[PDB]
Design a protein around this ligand. Structure first.
Ligand SMILES: Cc1cn([C@H]2C[C@H](O)[C@@H](CO)O2)c(=O)[nH]c1=O
Ligand SMILES: Cc1cn([C@H]2C[C@H](O)[C@@H](CO)O2)c(=O)[nH]c1=O
Length: 288
């Protein structure tokens, strides 16, 4: 499976932080926001990843993250000239995707919890259908909403219903079989002017192969939508990391733990960063 991080948008809520740059370049505590969703694809076992952003921000992501080789993966880049909807990732990424299965994650989504990598790996290893991930939120009318039965099978999915059928939002992480490319090419803009991911998921529902993984209350799916929520996300990460000796979404660590790079390669990554706490963390991991 390949992966895509959709990381543009004409985001304005966070002005003036985003006066120049896209939100996914902003810090969440001690690392750029984009590291979080990238870490999720990597933990899923996904090693070939396309990052899509605006004309002006795509080169900024490439300067930050590089070509992937340091992390034992492959990062590629494409431009979305206008934020015409999430489903457009699969049209921009047509050539990249080829005949393969593909996961999409949003560049501003942050997931965290015990047992999450088991779920990710399961979704990435599926050879047919789609997997979406549902999460209980306070104001579900503001999200895509997945309705399911007592056995956890999807009954419906609706984009920002005025009368939500459940309390479960459909989060910004999606795993698809290769049918997603032609599905994306066949749906039409909503009233919003957007090629809606909810429409892609409706198509998989109708095909009888939309699977939902319900993330319980022991998971965090953090809001980076406002200044207030960005700050709460930062504090959440700080708290988890301060207590343990352990980082959330440290890319070099994940590359080593996943077998993408060797202990030898991790040491070489740590060496030039030994003046800062981040390099020292990588070196400790190498030793231990
Ligand atoms: C509609 C749209 C949103 N986005 C981003 C902005 C937000 O971070 C997220 C959901 O709006 O997706 C894109 O990158 N491209 C798009 O076309
Ligand atoms: C092993 C490991 C897990 N994680 C995340 C995935 C889950 O959200 C949580 C528990 O495994 O920690 C990382 O961020 N980095 C890691 O190196």
């Amino acid at each position: 499976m390949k992966g895509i991080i959709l990381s543009g948008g004409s985001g304005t809520r966070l002005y003036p932080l985003t006066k120049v740059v896209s939100k996914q370049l902003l810090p969440v505590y001690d690392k750029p926001m984009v590291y979080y969703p990238l870490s999720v694809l990597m933990l899923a076992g996904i090693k070939d990843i396309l990052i899509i952003s605006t004309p002006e921000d795509t080169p900024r992501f490439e300067q930050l993250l590089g070509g992937g080789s340091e992390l034992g993966i492959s990062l590629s880049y494409a431009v979305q000239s206008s934020p015409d909807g999430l489903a457009q990732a699969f049209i921009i990424g047509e050539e990249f995707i080829g005949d393969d299965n593909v996961a999409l994650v949003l560049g501003d989504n942050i997931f965290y919890g015990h047992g999450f990598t088991e779920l990710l790996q399961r979704a990435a290893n599926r050879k047919s259908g789609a997997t979406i991930f549902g999460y209980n939120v306070k104001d579900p009318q503001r999200f895509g909403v997945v309705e399911f039965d007592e056995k956890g099978k999807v009954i419906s999915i609706e984009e920002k219903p005025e009368e939500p059928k459940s309390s479960y939002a459909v989060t910004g992480l999606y795993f698809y079989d290769n049918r997603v490319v032609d599905i994306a090419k066949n749906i039409t803009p909503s009233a919003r002017g957007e090629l809606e991911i909810t429409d892609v998921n409706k198509a998989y529902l109708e095909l009888g192969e939309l699977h939902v993984e319900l993330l319980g209350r022991g998971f965090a799916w953090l809001d980076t939508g406002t200044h207030e929520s960005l700050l709460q996300a930062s504090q959440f990460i700080e708290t988890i990391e301060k207590r343990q000796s352990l980082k959330v979404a440290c890319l070099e660590e994940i590359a080593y733990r996943m077998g993408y790079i060797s202990r030898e390669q991790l040491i070489k990554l740590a060496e030039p960063l030994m003046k800062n706490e981040y390099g020292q963390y990588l070196m400790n991991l190498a030793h231990r």
